[PDB]
Ligand code: HEM
């Protein structure tokens with residue numbers, strides 16, 4: 001059996017069978033639907049005290065091995081069987097197991113492919129993987145991270161990449177990045193009460209300050225890298241400025257846009273998620289793609305809880321800023337998005353508009369149903385923050401489910417860390 | 420216990436306990452989340468052959484009675500108990516029961532209040548209820564419907580109202596409106612292949628034609644009323660033109676907007692849903708509110724599957740219509756929304772912009788948690804089709820669940836009708 005999915009923009013239908021591979025449980029009860037919750041337990045993978053129990057690890061590893069050998073065009077049964085047996089014995093004798101380089105590479109791409117909230121998965125097969133499972137010290141992490149940033153930025157020609165640090169063992173020697181993303185701006189709560197910079201990073205910025213970092217009280221101060229190696233206490237690392245590429249904002253027609261003094265970094269790199277594969281868990285695996293215009297223009301700049309610049313852009317456009325019914329927000333928000341796209345393109349920094357991204361995803365989704373009868377998708381995250389109905393993703397029904405490999409969230413490290 | 424709900428725009432939290440009253444099951448499995456499905460079984464109430472079984476009716480009626488008497492500021496226990504006993508005996512002796520006028524009025528408002536996909540529920544206590552449970556013929560339905568339209572339009576000063584026809588008995592004498600809404604435009608598939616008018620009503624328009632209605636092949640031809648009384652075959656009824664108020668579209672700055680020849684009706688009136696209360700089911704209960712700018716400007720006019728006018732508005736604004744990345748759609752869509760709001764306001768027809776509606780709902784939601792610890796809400800339907808992130812509803816987490824009384828969908832009558 002399957003699940004019928006229809007696209008109201010074209011009356012097209014699809015049959016989802018891939019949801020049968022659904023790991024465990026999502027976060028919607030039998031009665032209620034918690035589909036709009038941002039960080040539900042179902043999407044989180046928390047700390048540990050002892051190694052993952054064999055009874056549960058062994059079966060997961062078997063699934064992944066089979067999954068891996070089942071992806072080849074031409075099967076290699078003999079190798080398939082040899083690997084199963086080996087892993088089985090290893091887990092049974094050592095209490096865990098190591099992945100081969102090719103299994104890890106496959107896993108990082110499948111996890112990306114299974115990320116329901118990612119709009120850019122059509123790029124899933126193009127992923128540079130940096131194997132840092134050898135790493136043991138904070139300084140070495142720092143180095144791997146710097147190499148990653150340098151490779152991924154590629155002077156504006158953004159390249160998708162991921163760096164995998166040592167897998168979790170007993171959970172008391174976890175490798176962790178305490179940062180939300182590799183590159184982010186600091187947020188400071190001034191005496192008067194006002195916030196300076198990015199309000200979203202207040203807790204973290206305050207944390208860095210406690211760890212010895214010198215607050216520069218700027219509006220766009222790149223935060224430091226806070227690294228945790230082998231369950232060891234976190235160490236602060238300033239990011240070499242040459243490595244951080246930034247785009248200064250200017251509108252193609254409004255010369256006063258420049259006067260706002262806005263700028264944003266070119267590399268979006270989630271640094272705090274956990275990669276799960278065949279029972280193994282990697283709590284440190286920073287990855288990056290390239291930006292979608294609306295993340296910066298709509299969310300980062302316009303979100304009331306972020307740089308909240310709408311009001312100002314409105315006045316400067318001379319709109320009825322005090323008459324909500326005039327739709328001034330709609331006008332300003334569009335001019336901000338045009339500036340963002342224009343700026344990235346003028347400084348040759350890879351970037352994609354939400355319409356193009358939307359049409360792109362729709363192509364990926366079709367390929368997916370056509371390749372494996374399914375494609376986990378979170379409608380709420382996949383529909384752009386503006387122009388929703390104008391993009392095809394809006395008219396597409398979709399099912400959301402957790403597969404494996406998968407990128408899970410984690411509890412903020414500073415809340416579960418034994419100092 | 421409860422469920423923690425957070426608003427990321429203000430860090431505010433709420434505790435949902437009202438979800439405990441959740442009827443049966445939603446449409447999200449234990450593993451998968453079908454929260455983006457438009458017409459899931461969980462939201463539909465289909466046909467019948469025999470009267471609703473006592474074993475299940477009696478308990479529902481008891482719940483509703485209790486619910487009704489529990490809403491008074493000052494309890495009336497004696498009356499509470501008298502009513503329970505009476506209903507109990509009636510169901511036990513007649514196989515069903517009748518609601519009092521006040522119970523019905525309460526029920527229609529609670530059902531509105533429990534409609535998770537409605538953005539305008541802050542108006543829930545203001546509802547004109549027309550009791551047509553006495554009705555027996557198609558012509559009488561037609562009359563009630565005409566009275567409803569006349570009262571609700573109120574020459575532009577739109578008033579919310581609902582007309583309740585006879586409740587379902589054995590399911591073989593159902594009263595039904597075959598129309599999507601009371602007032603809608605016809606859609607015609609021309610020989611060449613092109614569609615004329617509203618594509619969304621092709622199946623229905625074709626149906627009317629089969630029933631004898633004369634297709635005027637226009638672009639804005641008000642469809643006829645197709646009424647079903649007492650399980651009797653449907654009868655076509657032209658709507659007196661004087662009763663149908665229409666707004667002609669013109670932009671406040673672009674004189675060429677008028678040249679597009681757009682117009683829309685002033686009364687949005689869902690005509691095909693089923694009202695469920697204490698086990699009883701009313702398959703005929705047309706209701707109406709007033710419009711939200713985006714329903715007409717964004718969905719009705721811009722939806723590719725509807726009047727699809729974006730491209731044309733784009734050319735006429737001289738935008739790079741062939742460069743998706745230019746964000747021309749974003750610009751056109753805004754000008755269309757301004758025309759719609761401007762037009763309704765110039766002709767004094769009640770209407771609300773999506774920002775105001777959004778802020779309004781957020782106020783309702785707060786009152787609700789504060790009044791009964793909950794408020795079923797469908798994020799996917801409550802977030803406007805454009806400017807999503809710019810409205811506060813977007814940053815509000817919410818839970819979706821089916822309570823009772825409730826407005827359910829139904830299977831198109833022409834698919835389950837015994838001619
Ligand atoms: C080709 C470039 C890519 C684009 C255009 C893209 C775009 C996006 C966007 C728009 C989001 C939403 C972020 C937000 O709302 O804050 C997202 C989420 C996500 N993407 Fe991608 N992505 C890309 C590459 C990647 C890569 C390389 C991976 C992993 C290997 C990935 C994994 C995910 C995950 C796990 C999320 C969820 C993030 C969260 O929940 O906070 N994406 N992506």
Ligand code: HEM
Pocket residue numbers: 527531534536537538539540542546579580581689692706707708709710711714771826
């Ligand atoms: C005060 C005016 C009202 C406003 C501004 C309002 C607005 C809306 C909007 C924007 C929708 C979405 C329609 C769509 O997406 O196609 C909706 C849905 C809904 N509203 Fe309201 N509403 C109002 C009055 C009412 C009334 C009087 C009732 C019932 C007594 C009601 C019941 C519902 C229901 C059941 C839905 C779901 C419709 C569907 O699923 O197709 N609304 N409303």
Ligand SMILES: C[C@H](O)[C@H](O)[C@H]1CNc2nc(N)[nH]c(=O)c2N1
Pocket residue numbers: 036037038380381382427813814815816817
């Ligand atoms: C409450 C709601 O879940 C929340 O605001 C979501 C909505 N959709 C989103 N979609 C994306 N891509 N990113 C987000 O941060 C959000 N926030």
Ligand SMILES: C[C@H](O)[C@H](O)[C@H]1CNc2nc(N)[nH]c(=O)c2N1
Pocket residue numbers: 008394395396397398455456457799800801
């Ligand atoms: C597929 C998806 O459920 C569908 O396009 C929904 C999204 N949100 C909506 N929201 C409202 N108000 N009305 C709609 O018709 C829809 N369509």
Ligand SMILES: [C-]#N
Pocket residue numbers: 118268270288289
């Ligand atoms: C995607 N990050």
Ligand SMILES: [C-]#N
Pocket residue numbers: 537687689707708
């Ligand atoms: C609301 N209709």
Ligand SMILES: [Zn+2]
Pocket residue numbers: 028032033034035447451452453454
């Ligand atoms: Zn759900």
